[PDB]
């Protein structure tokens, strides 16, 4: 049961063999946390109401 590291892509496997699931190393884990903190984590807008006059 292996799932890719969402930071670097290093395929690391589930279980106690990895203490930073689903990350491989903690630094990447921390980097992802920083991204969440930094609002680096987005989902692009689809082509849910926007007002033209409003901001």
């Amino acid at each position: 049961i292996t799932v890719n590291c969402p930071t670097c892509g290093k395929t690391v496997v589930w279980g106690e063999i990895s203490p930073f699931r689903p990350f491989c190393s903690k630094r990447c884990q921390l980097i992802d946390l920083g991204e969440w903190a930094a609002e680096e984590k987005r989902i692009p807008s689809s082509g849910s109401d926007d007002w033209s006059e409003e901001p």
């Binding site: 849910s48 109401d49 007002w51 033209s52 006059e53 409003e54």
Partner: protein, 505 residues
């Protein structure tokens, strides 16, 4: 020197940012409400989605992509913003904390009962209309309201050179004050105040001191302090005090208040707070503040009055548009201008009702004499292939007259249209096109025996009606009596307990 253009700008801006004193509404209020009226979004009829009203409004009366419209629609639905709501909303319409209302496609809405009393006799040529942005629609310059509204729901806005800040009042009390005005024009402010002690707040809370209220109602301007209904409850077993707050001044944000308190204890500007919690739920507002072993409850409380909006100063500045210009006006001036409006409203109303009943009288008479004269008209129209020829034949010849007796029996000179020229109508010779069309477009389902009787009885009814209408226009005192019974009906319909306490000094 204030020039010509400058004053233009000052005029439109104010005219958008202050209300007329008659209905106590700004343009956007009126537009939203009237649009809801045209759309027939009534109070006992099923809800509509906040979207449709908004679309209609943008299309007809407010052609901007502005949340302005949906924001107005929303505010009218929130119990904590309007004393007496003008919009029955279902769904999630926000919260006092500052939570937003759901998207305008989820939340549904329909006018409130009081809203219908705000637009009662609107179709009865009661008040001028005016063109929309494309001239293809009309919109009411004022509303034929039966509720004070200005005094009742209050008004708040900021403009170029002046602003208005009127608090809301209890309807019951305001109506009472109106009645007292009518019965006693030349009355005195001290007198009106016998019926309205002061402002009423949806939130509730308390008001500290009557002096400001009094100065306001006398002048139009006065500062009055709204204190929150907080309470200190002492737990018997441990002796550990715990404040608790149940209501808070009008227009104060719960979240910003709580955050301000937390900030105040973090900066250590106020001490003696062990915990700060928001336990408000379906049971109502509560704010729990837990006093430390070290501290005294009441002391912490007074600090939370001194350094927070748990006590806040409401500045009353009663400005409103008198005619097309803005004017500061005391309480009596306001009630007086409401009432003038009622005099104009009900008078225009009765003239419209008059014209209606007169036209109905004319046509019903035509139908009568038609029912009496059935066979020869069936024949004459029988023969003529063209409807216009049949018409001309109908008009060309007067006809004769159980139908005639009551025409004569229940006639004054007038059931006649005020537009009728002298020649037409009744020597026992009917001088008669309009009516000719009225019978040319007569259905066959009517030729049954008792439909006449129905039309006669209806004619007698209309005669009693025009009698009462003429009676109502004839005596000004009668007009006033009608208005009094109308207001009495209003305060019998919606009358609410006082919600805000008033304590002197």
């Amino acid at each position: 020197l204030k020039s010509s253009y400058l004053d233009y700008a000052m005029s439109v801006i104010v005219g958008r940012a202050l209300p007329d004193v008659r209905d106590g509404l700004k343009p956007v209020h009126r537009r939203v409400l009237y649009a809801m009226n045209v759309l027939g979004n009534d109070w006992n009829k099923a809800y509509k989605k906040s979207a449709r009203v908004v679309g209609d409004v943008i299309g007809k009366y407010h052609p901007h992509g502005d949340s302005a419209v949906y924001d107005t629609i929303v505010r009218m639905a929130q119990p904590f913003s309007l004393r007496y709501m003008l919009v029955d909303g279902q769904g999630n319409f926000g919260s006092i904390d500052g939570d937003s209302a759901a998207a305008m496609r989820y939340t549904e809405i329909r006018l409130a009962k009081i809203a219908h009393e705000l637009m009662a006799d609107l179709e009865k040529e009661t008040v001028d209309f005016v063109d929309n942005y494309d001239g293809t629609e009309k919109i009411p310059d004022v509303m034929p309201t039966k509720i004070p509204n200005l005094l009742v729901n209050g008004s708040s806005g900021i403009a170029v050179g002046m602003a208005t800040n009127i608090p809301p009042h209890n309807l019951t009390e305001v109506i009472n004050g109106c009645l007292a005005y009518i019965d006693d024009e030349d009355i005195s402010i001290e007198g009106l105040m016998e019926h309205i002690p002061g402002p009423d707040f949806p939130t509730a809370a308390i008001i500290n001191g009557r002096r400001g209220i009094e100065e306001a109602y006398r002048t139009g301007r006065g500062k009055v302090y709204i204190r929150a209904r907080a309470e200190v409850e002492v737990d018997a077993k441990t002796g550990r005090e715990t404040i608790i707050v149940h209501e808070i001044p009008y227009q104060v944000n719960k979240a910003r208040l709580i955050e301000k308190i937390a900030e105040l204890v973090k900066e250590k500007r106020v001490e003696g707070i062990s915990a700060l919690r928001d336990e408000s739920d379906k049971d109502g507002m509560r704010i729990v503040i837990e006093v430390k072993r070290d501290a005294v409850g009441e002391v912490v409380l007074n600090n939370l009055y001194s350094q927070t909006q748990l006590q806040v100063s409401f500045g009353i500045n009663m400005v409103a548009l008198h005619h097309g210009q803005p004017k500061i006006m005391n309480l009596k001036d306001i009630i007086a201008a409401f009432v003038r409006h009622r005099r104009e409203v009900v008078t225009r109303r009765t003239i419209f009702e008059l014209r209606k009943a007169r036209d109905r009288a004319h046509i019903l008479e035509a139908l009568a004499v038609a029912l009496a004269n059935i066979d020869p008209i069936i024949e004459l129209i029988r023969h003529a292939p063209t409807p216009a020829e049949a018409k001309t034949a109908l008009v060309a010849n007067p006809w004769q007259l159980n139908v005639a007796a009551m025409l004569e029996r229940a006639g004054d000179d007038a059931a006649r249209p005020e537009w009728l020229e002298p020649e037409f109508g009744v020597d026992g010779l009917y001088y008669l096109e309009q009516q000719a069309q009225a019978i040319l477009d007569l259905r066959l389902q009517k030729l049954t025996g008792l439909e006449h009787e129905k039309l006669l009885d209806e004619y007698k009814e209309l005669l009693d009606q025009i009698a009462e209408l003429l009676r109502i226009l004839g005596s000004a005192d009668r007009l006033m009596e009608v208005i009094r019974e109308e207001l009495e009906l209003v305060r019998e319909q919606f009358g609410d307990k006082r919600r805000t306490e008033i304590t002197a000094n």
